[PDB]
Amino acid sequence: MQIGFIGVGLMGGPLARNLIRAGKDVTVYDLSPEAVKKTLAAGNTGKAAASLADLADKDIVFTSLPLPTHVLGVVLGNDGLLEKLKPGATHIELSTIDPQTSVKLEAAARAKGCHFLQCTLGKTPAHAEKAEEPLFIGGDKAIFDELAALWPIIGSPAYYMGTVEASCAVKLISNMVGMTNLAVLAEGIRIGEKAGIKRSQLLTLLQDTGARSFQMDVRGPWIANDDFANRFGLDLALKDVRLGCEMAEAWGMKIPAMMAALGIFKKASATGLGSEDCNAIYKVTE
Amino acid sequence: MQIGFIGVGLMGGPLARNLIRAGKDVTVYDLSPEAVKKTLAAGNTGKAAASLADLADKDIVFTSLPLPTHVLGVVLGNDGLLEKLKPGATHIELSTIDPQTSVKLEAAARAKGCHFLQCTLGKTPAHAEKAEEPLFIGGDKAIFDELAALWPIIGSPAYYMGTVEASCAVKLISNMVGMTNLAVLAEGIRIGEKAGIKRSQLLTLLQDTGARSFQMDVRGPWIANDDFANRFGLDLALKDVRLGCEMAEAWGMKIPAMMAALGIFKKASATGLGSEDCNAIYKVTE
């Protein structure tokens, strides 16, 4: 069985590597030659692609790219990927994109005679390396079921979301809620500082209250040690939060608290600290 | 040793009861005659007060009242409580008030020759009944140390916050962060509904992500079952959040996400669902 894999970036690369380690016939296509080298170095069963048309014979094509614009550009041009596919081929989309975009992708695929699944990824690239990341698969239940043997190779539990928009939405919501939780935690810590409470003590005390959150337990200590080393890049956070905020709002929503979080992430990125971790928004919270 | 206790309401009543059960000489003063009866029924060692001047001989006076306006009115009139106190008496203030107010209270007490501690209370009245609620004590370290034998009777760990404003602030921050966490969780759940994800499944999935929070685990199920029975009254939440937001802002702050939470709580109270639990803000989230 013949797999193509466009984009072996930070989360896509680990899934492609796991496919290669499992002996599958993966041919990677990435504009970064050494992303390709890194992923291709996991076994002798994976090969690189000279151009996009090298993926035309493929039975399954994975896509993992940074922006919805990129997925549409690679898959949906006249000289894009979808026009070169066998009917019956399946496009699995791993990118954290918005529901509008992936619905457009799915209708393209169905209109040509191809199958399409959205498959957004949870947790860390560290998890994805071990296939211990959740998969949120949406799309035609027939294809999710048909591909039952594939999923354990790439992901943790294979959650079936039903619709493709659910698949995008659960990923975006988890990042919206987590990053807003973090922005709110930063607001709390900064308030405590105006009351003369050291961050350390404030965290220790809040730990046994109803204010507790995963971000509190995980990133509170880092903020308390002025540690902003990249774990989840601030500009990655901002990208995903902005995308989710656009996704709502396209649905007519208001989500004021999350919009405020979006604002603080934008302000931090503008301060030029987009390469630091999420918690760097603390540095611009006031 | 002679204790007076003004306000045996929802959190004050359990502490007064615990003082009575421990055999202490507590005389309660409350404008609700049957709050007094309920608290006074915990033993034969506690008695009721005909008027405020019945508390004039007292060595320690606890105050637990709903608004900062009420504490100032009871303690700081010309015919208020403080004028009738022995020098050397101690005013312990249990109310969730703002730092401006309790600093005013403390300066009044020191200017008369009395001692003053702020002692805000964490967790639930259920906890307070068993003295398993945290105490955040701020004020003169000498008095906190002198009263070392008293604290285990009324509270869980006796945390010493140092300054009185720290004592107010840690209570308010915990409620600000917790209620904003809840408003943000409501935003996430409501977004998931616009994507066609049932609340149940969205919660189950978000539980194993970085969006997890105490409010998620505790009140997520209730929202998922359309259960809004009072656990923490929405109007109580709104009161405390508004107070904390005023406390910041008096410090020149902006805290946008928390201000948005304040807005949604105000909107819910205006919809007339102030007697339901916190999570009822979900009903007006959009």
Cα(B28)–Cα(A280) distance, rounded to whole angstroms?
50
Domains of chain B: which residue ranges? Answer: 2-162, 174-284
From chain B, pick out residues whose CB is under 8 angstroms from the CB of A176: 187-188, 191, 211
A176:B196 CB<8 A: no
Residue of chain A with shortest Cα separation from B193: A166
Task: Read off the tokens for A136.
Answer: 């949120």
Both tokens of residue A180? 């807003």
Selection from A208, A173, A206, A164 nearest residue A188 by Cα: A206
**Of B214, B258, B263, which has the smallest distance from its Cβ to A213's Cβ?**
B214
CATH level 3 topology of B2-162: Rossmann fold (3.40.50)
Closest partner CB to A210 (pick from B161, B178, B253): B178
Residues of B in contact with A253 (CB under 8 A): 190-191, 194, 286
- From B122, B169, B205, residue closest to A170, measured CB to CB: B205
Mutate to test the interface with B, among A191, A193, A214 (most CBs of B within 10 A): A191
Here the tokens at position A74 are 């690679």
**Rounded CA separation A280/A201 (Å):** 20
The position carrying tokens 């006031």 is A286
Structure tokens at A67: 């922006």
Q: B194 and A251: CB-CB below 8 Å? A: yes
Half-sphere exposure of B132 (CA within 13 A, CB side): 6
* CA separation for the pair A245, A259 (Å, rounded): 7
Q: Nearest-CA distance from A108 to chain B in Å?
A: 21
Alpha-carbon distance A144 to A151, whole Å? 9
Q: Which helix (H) or strand (E) holds A250?
A: helix A234-250
For A116, list phi and psi in degrees, rounded to 5. Answer: -145, 130
Q: Do A218 and B211 touch (CB under 8 A)?
A: no
Q: How far apart are CA B121 and CA B154, in angstroms?
A: 10
Calculate how close chain A gets to B135, using CA atoms only, in Å: 11
Q: Is residue A191 classed exposed, middle or buried when 0-12, 13-18 and 19+ CB atoms within 10 A define those classes?
A: buried
Give me the sheet containing B158-162, strands edge to edge. B46-48, B25-29, B2-6, B60-63, B90-93, B115-121, B135-139, B158-162
Chain A residues whose beta carbon lies within 8 Å of the beta carbon of residue B100: none
Instruction: Name residues whose C-beta falls within 8 Å of residue A194's C-beta, 6 or more positions apart in sequence.
Output: B169, B248, B251, B253
CB B191 within 8 A of CB A176: yes
Please state, in angstroms and as integers, the Cα–Cα distance from residue A61 to each residue in A1, A101, B242, B266, following that order. 11, 17, 53, 50
What kind of experiment solved this structure? X-ray
Q: Which residue has the tokens 């509270």?
A: B155
Alpha-carbon distance B106 to B91, whole Å? Answer: 9
Alpha carbon of B182: minimum distance to chain A alpha carbons (Å): 9
Q: Which amino acid is at A25?
A: D
Work out how many CB contacts closer than 8 A connect A with B.
203
Kindly list the distances between the CA atom of residue B260 and the CA atoms of A31, B76, B85, B182, B232, in Å, as whole numbers in the listed order. 43, 34, 43, 12, 20
For the domain bounded by A169-284, which CATH number is listed?
1.10.1040.10
Homologous superfamily, domain B174-284? N-(1-d-carboxylethyl)-l-norvaline Dehydrogenase; domain 2 (1.10.1040.10)
Q: Which residues of A66-104 are buried (b: 16+ CB within 10 A; e: fewer)?
A: bebeebbebbbeeeebbebbeeebbbbbbbbbbbebbbb
Cβ(B149)–Cβ(B99) below 8 Å: no
Hey, are the CB atoms on B170 and A202 less than 8 Å from each other? yes
Can you tell me whether residue A136 is helix, strand or coil? strand
Determine the distance in angstroms separating the CA of A132 from the nearest CA of chain B, rounded to an integer: 12
Q: B214 vs A115, A213, A278, B160, B185, CA distance in Å?
A: 40, 6, 21, 25, 10
Mutual angle of helices A199-206 and A164-194, in 10-degree steps: 120
- Data resolution in angstroms: 2.9
Which residues of chain B neighbour A257 with C-beta distances below 8 Å?
Answer: 180, 183-184, 187, 257, 260-261, 264
Nearest to B192 by CA among B176, B174, B209, B179: B209
CA-to-CA dists, residue B170 to A134, A196, A199, B162, angstroms: 36, 10, 11, 12
The three-state (H, E, C) secondary structure of chain B, written as one string: CEEEEECCCCCHHHHHHHHHHCCCEEEEECCCHHHHHHHHCCCCCEEECCCHHHHCCCCEEEECCCCHHHHHHHHHCCCCCHHHCCCCCEEEECCCCCHHHHHHHHHHHHHHCCEEEEEEECCCHHHHHCCCCCEEEEECHHHHHHCCCCHHHHCCCEEEEECHHHHHHHHHHHHHHHHHHHHHHHHHHHHHHHCCCCHHHHHHHHCCCCCCEHHHHHHHHHHHCCCCCCCCEHHHHHHHHHHHHHHHHHCCCCCHHHHHHHHHHHHHHHHCCCCCEHHHHHHHCC
Q: Hey, are the CB atoms on A256 and B264 less than 8 Å from each other?
A: yes
H-helix or E-strand spanning residue A153: helix A151-154
Going through chain A in order, the beta strands assigned E by DSSP cover 2-6, 25-29, 46-48, 60-63, 90-93, 115-121, 135-139, 158-162
State how beta strands B2-6 and A158-162 pair: unpaired
Q: Cα–Cα distance between A52 and A73 in angstroms, integer?
A: 12
Cβ contact A251–B197 (<8 Å):
no
Query: Do the bridges between strand B46-48 and strand B25-29 make them parallel or antiparallel, or are there none, so unpaired?
Result: parallel
Sign of CA dihedral A35, A37, A41, A45: positive
| 8 A C-beta contact, residue B62 and residue B12 | yes
In angstroms, rounded to a whole number, what is the distance separating the alpha carbons of residues B161 and B170? 9
Question: Do you know the residue count of chain B?
Answer: 286
Task: Retrieve residue B22's tokens.
Answer: 């421990």
B90-93 and A60-63 strand pairing: unpaired
Placement of tokens 């041919």 in the chain: A27
Report CA-CA distances (Å) from A163 to A32, A143, A144, B152: 32, 12, 11, 56
Find, among B54, B58, B49, the residue nearest to B87 by Cα: B58
> Is the Cβ pair B213, A181 closer than 8 Å?
yes
> Within 13 A of B238's CA, how many CA atoms are on the CB side?
20
